[PDB]
């Protein structure tokens, strides 16, 4: 009926929305509300069939490689286990969370919400986790990674498609078509019912958790979810500054130390990211270009964009306001793709595992690269555009 924009503080009346209809802010044109879509039972069935399909998708080999007269089969679990046995437990854990853990947590959340419907247990942090978890479900990125790796090692040996590749493709398609219709405010309004306002109050705040507009109670908590309600974020500037500085500091050991070590006939290569991308540009520049633009262009772009945004917040510049928001949206959209390098090196070290002729191993630099990617993603997510809009 009447709401307030969560990114520029625009209080506007909300007309009724149909299935194909969509609502946007009149000022900054940001997505605000939806509805209708699918039902909870369809999502539960999708979660159930994902639970059925996942173990036979991860367990079965992705592709067979015939190297030096020896047939080698590999999958995700073997690569993660070899990463852990090497010693880099943190890199293996973050790869596990990015690839394997997220669908499991999604299925668990849907099942627990269904059991809360059946029983009546509290579901307050579960909805917040469900809303924030759509960013980390990166299965199509892993599909692009295995395609890039298959192109990369096509010349070295003979590659044949595995049985589990079809199941993995089916799982990816199912996750994509399920996440494309998962609505959170519909769940919030179905489980917890509220009432609209008088269309003109000039005192309604926006909850950063559930996008709800309403007066705070005597405890200062949101009437829909048990978190405090404030005008802006608490320490967004300080947290953003600390995370950006941490990412900038951790960038240097990621780029200087070697990332991949290739023992070739008893001799190791020990080349860094720059040497690897130079060799890839020399050999297979067609894929080296997309690797370069999706591996080292995105992190530096995000770092400089965040630094310029912080300097504009300090400087109170009002010259490029119409473009800073679009740059922030593009950075938020593009920060997810930066995890391609870890997937590629994981698959290559899982595939090329000859005893002494060819030994592909991960060096002590991917940990810093993954830490920098996570820190810059959190720095981008932690910032608020309302500080920029109020900087005028």
């Amino acid at each position: 009926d009447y709401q307030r924009c969560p990114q520029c503080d625009m209080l506007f009346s909300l007309p009724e929305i149909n299935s194909h209809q969509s609502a946007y802010c009149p000022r900054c044109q940001a997505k605000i509300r939806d509805g209708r879509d699918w039902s909870l039972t369809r999502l539960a069935a999708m979660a159930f069939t994902m639970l059925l399909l996942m173990p036979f998708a991860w367990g079965e080999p992705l592709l067979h490689i015939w190297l030096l007269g020896i047939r080698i089969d590999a999958n995700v679990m073997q690569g993660i286990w070899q990463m852990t046995k090497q010693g880099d437990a943190i890199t293996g854990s973050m790869v596990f969370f990015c690839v394997i853990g997220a669908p499991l947590i999604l299925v668990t959340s849907i099942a627990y919400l269904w059991f809360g419907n059946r029983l009546g247990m509290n579901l307050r942090p579960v909805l917040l986790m469900l809303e924030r978890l759509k960013e980390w479900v990166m299965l199509d990125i892993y599909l692009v990674g295995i395609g890039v790796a298959s192109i990369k090692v096509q010349d070295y040996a003979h590659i044949q498609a595995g049985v589990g590749l079809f199941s993995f493709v089916a799982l990816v398609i199912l996750t994509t078509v399920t996440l494309s219709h998962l609505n959170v405010e519909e769940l919030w309004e179905r489980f917890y019912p509220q009432r609209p306002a008088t269309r003109r109050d000039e005192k309604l705040r926006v909850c950063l958790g559930c996008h709800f507009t309403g007066y705070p109670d005597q405890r200062g908590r949101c009437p829909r979810c048990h978190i405090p309600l404030r005008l802006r974020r608490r320490h967004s500037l300080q947290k953003c500054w600390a995370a950006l500085l941490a990412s900038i500091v951790l960038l240097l050991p990621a780029n200087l130390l070697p990332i991949s070590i290739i023992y070739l006939n008893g001799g190791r290569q020990e080349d860094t990211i720059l040497s690897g991308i130079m060799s890839l540009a020399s050999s297979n520049i067609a894929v080296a270009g997309i690797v370069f633009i999706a591996s080292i262009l995105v992190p530096f772009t995000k770092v400089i964009v965040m630094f310029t945004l912080l300097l504009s917040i300090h400087f109170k510049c009002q010259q490029g306001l119409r473009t800073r928001i679009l740059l922030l949206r593009m950075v938020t959209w593009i920060g997810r793709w930066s995890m391609l390098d870890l997937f590629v090196i994981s698959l290559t070290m899982s595939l090329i595992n000859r005893d002494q002729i060819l030994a592909f191993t991960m060096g002590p630099a991917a940990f810093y690269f993954g830490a920098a990617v996570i820190l810059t993603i959190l720095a981008v997510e932690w910032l608020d555009s309302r500080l920029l809009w109020d900087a005028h």
Binding site: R42, A45, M46, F48, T49, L52, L53, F56, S167, A170, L174
Partner: peptide, 30 residues
């Protein structure tokens, strides 16, 4: 609609049955 959760359920049952079919005997050698 509900056609896909049934087709995928049938595929999962088929591959489970195929996995259960192909198991051999374990022998110990000295």
């Amino acid at each position: 609609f509900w056609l896909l959760p049934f087709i995928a359920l049938m595929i999962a049952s088929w591959l489970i049955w195929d996995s259960y079919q192909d198991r051999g005997n374990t022998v110990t050698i000295d």
